RNA sequence: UUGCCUUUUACCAGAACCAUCCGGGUGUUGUCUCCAUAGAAACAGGUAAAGCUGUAUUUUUU
């Protein structure tokens, strides 16, 4: 139980981190505000896998 | 924050803080260079020259 129970809260952490993430470069994307091609495609595939969810 | 852009440096152009640099005085010393060398004169007043003032009949002194 604790230890999957810590390791639960780290990977909502790295969720809340990646998510938010996926969502300024999303923002951005929108903007034009000078996103990396292989950024880009990351959070398309991200955004996708996000959605899917 | 923008822009070219899509990797970065190297860049666009604005902002805010900051620094670096190429320079600048001023003052005080110290030097370097070039020219130079006197240790005592005013008072009594003249001689000469420079600074300023002047040109008795009701309120100044006739």
């Given at each position: 139980?604790p230890?999957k129970?810590?390791?639960?809260?780290?990977?909502?952490?790295?969720?809340?981190?990646?998510?938010?993430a996926?969502?300024?470069?999303?923002e951005?994307?929108?903007?034009?505000?000078?996103?990396?091609?292989?950024?880009?495609?990351?959070?398309?595939?991200?955004?996708?896998?996000?959605?899917?969810?």
């Amino acid at each position: 139980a604790p230890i999957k129970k810590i390791i639960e809260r780290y990977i909502k952490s790295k969720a809340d981190a990646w998510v938010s993430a996926a969502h300024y470069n999303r923002e951005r994307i929108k903007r034009g505000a000078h996103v990396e091609k292989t950024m880009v495609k990351k959070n398309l595939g991200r955004l996708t896998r996000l959605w899917i969810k």
